[PDB]
Every structure is written in C-alpha cells, then in structure tokens.
C-alpha cells in the first residue's frame, strides 16, 4: 500500500509541477488560479501523514477482521494513543471507508445487495481489497455468496468440501481460472 500510494502522490506532484512549469512558459487574475500550486503544502502534509495513514489502513485490512464495532473502536483508541507515543503525523479525523474505496465501488457493491451499514461495508472492502492472501468469509446468512456472485457475474461455482466432485471441478476450474467459492468453512 505504501509503495502504491507513494507512487500515486509522486505522479500527482509531477503533474502539478508540470502544470506550474507550463503556466510559467505560457491576465492578472491568475492569482485565483495558482491555488492549484498553493495546494503543494497540502500535498506535503498528506505526504508526511500518509505513512501513518497507510499503517492504520493495513491494520484495518488485517487485524480488524475479528473485531466488532466496540472492539474496533477500542483498538482504534489504543492504536492512536500508541501512535502518539511514537508521534507520527496523521489526520486525527479520518474515515477508513472513505480512504481506500471510492463511491463508485460503493454503489456497485450496494447494488450487488450489501446491507447499508458501516460494519459490513468495511468487511466487504477488506475482503475484496487484498488478493495476496485468500479471504475467509464468516457469516450465518448465505446471501453473502449471492452478492459475491452478483459482483462477479456469471463466474461463481457452488463447490463444497463434502462433495467428492469438488476436487475434479476445482481441477477443471483452475485451468481457465473461474472464480470458485467453497461453502464448508468448518
């Protein structure tokens, strides 16, 4: 995440500096236009806080998969206090779901059938956010598989550990790489 976001801010700074140089080599009202380059200090503050912000994002993605709302809030209080113990800059007011996923993915997922609550939005964001490690869906309701298939279209297969053909069907699907969801978490 730090690599990707530092890259992103790198091209952002390159683009704004290219715009400044272009204006340099290009009315007296351009002082109302140089706000784009006056945002360089805002970009610098985002640069100096993104390390901690990406940190807390990573703990969200990994650690917060076992915690309820109360547990998540308590862990946030603990983690922010201990950040202050090793003071590193980060915006004190910060929203997780407004930081990693844009509104486009939000309305796409909600159209798939997500419950309109912060907890499940965070859970869906973290489950579909990282692909390096396989995710573990944990819920009594089976509508999660339905909404996952909705997001994936006509690619979900219904395979179970207790099914003997699961091995053969999996060996078939792996070759052309169809998305597989297995429902035997136990």
């Amino acid at each position: 995440l730090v690599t990707a976001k530092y890259q992103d801010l790198q091209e952002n700074q390159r683009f704004v500096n290219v715009g400044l140089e272009k204006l340099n080599e290009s009315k007296s009202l351009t002082f109302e236009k140089e706000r784009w380059l006056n945002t360089t200090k805002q970009f610098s503050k985002t640069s100096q806080e993104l390390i901690g912000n990406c940190i807390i994002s990573s703990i969200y993605e990994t650690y917060f998969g076992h915690l309820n709302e109360r547990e998540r809030a308590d862990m946030l209080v603990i983690l922010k206090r201990l950040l202050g113990k090793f003071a590193v800059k980060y915006d004190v007011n910060y929203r997780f779901i407004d930081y990693l996923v844009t509104l486009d993915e939000k309305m796409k997922w909600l159209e798939c059938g997500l419950d309109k609550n912060d907890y499940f939005l965070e859970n869906m964001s973290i489950v579909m956010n990282s692909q390096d490690a396989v995710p573990f869906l944990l819920d009594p309701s089976s509508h999660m598989i339905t909404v996952i298939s909705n997001y994936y279209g006509n690619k979900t297969v219904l395979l179970s550990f207790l099914e003997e053909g699961f091995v053969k069907r999996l060996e078939n699907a792996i070759r052309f790489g169809s998305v597989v969801i297995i429902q035997d978490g136990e």
């Binding site: 715009g19 272009k22 204006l23 290009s26 009202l29 109302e32 236009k33 706000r35 784009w36 509104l103």
Partner: protein
Amino acid sequence: LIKLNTEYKLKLKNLEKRLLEELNNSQGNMLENDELMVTLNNLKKEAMNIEKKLSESEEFFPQFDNLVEEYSIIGKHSVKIFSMLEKFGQF
C-alpha cells in the same frame, strides 16, 4: 452534500483536463483567449461552491455528536433489553 462535493471534486478534475487541453492549444486565437474568461468564472463558481459546502459541513460534527447523545441513551438500554430477551430465550 457528501456525494455532492465528491461529484464537484470530480468536476474540478474534469476542469483540470480542460485546462490542459487548452494549454496544449496556446494563445493563438482571441476566441480561445476570451472563452477562458468564462472558463475561469465557472471555475471560481465551483470553487466557492466547494468553500461554502465545506464551511457548512464544518459546524455539523458538533451538532451530529450532540444529537447522537439521545440515540446513545436509547441504545444503552436497548442493549439491556436485548440481553434480557435472549436470557429468556436461553432459559
């Protein structure tokens, strides 16, 4: 208003593309040197929209968490009602 200012930020990004499109075209045409007047006027209108809506959003979190106090005093009793309900359920 949250989705509104998000859309206005994307519109500002689109205006940034328009600015570059123009800067590629140089100051060769007087029409091209006068349409930027209304371009910057619309840009300032969007900027003042952003400023006014951010200012409006500034004084809402205190009101927001003042109003959540009633919902919290409701909830900390609703949870007890729930707990006793499943106490009967397990009984």
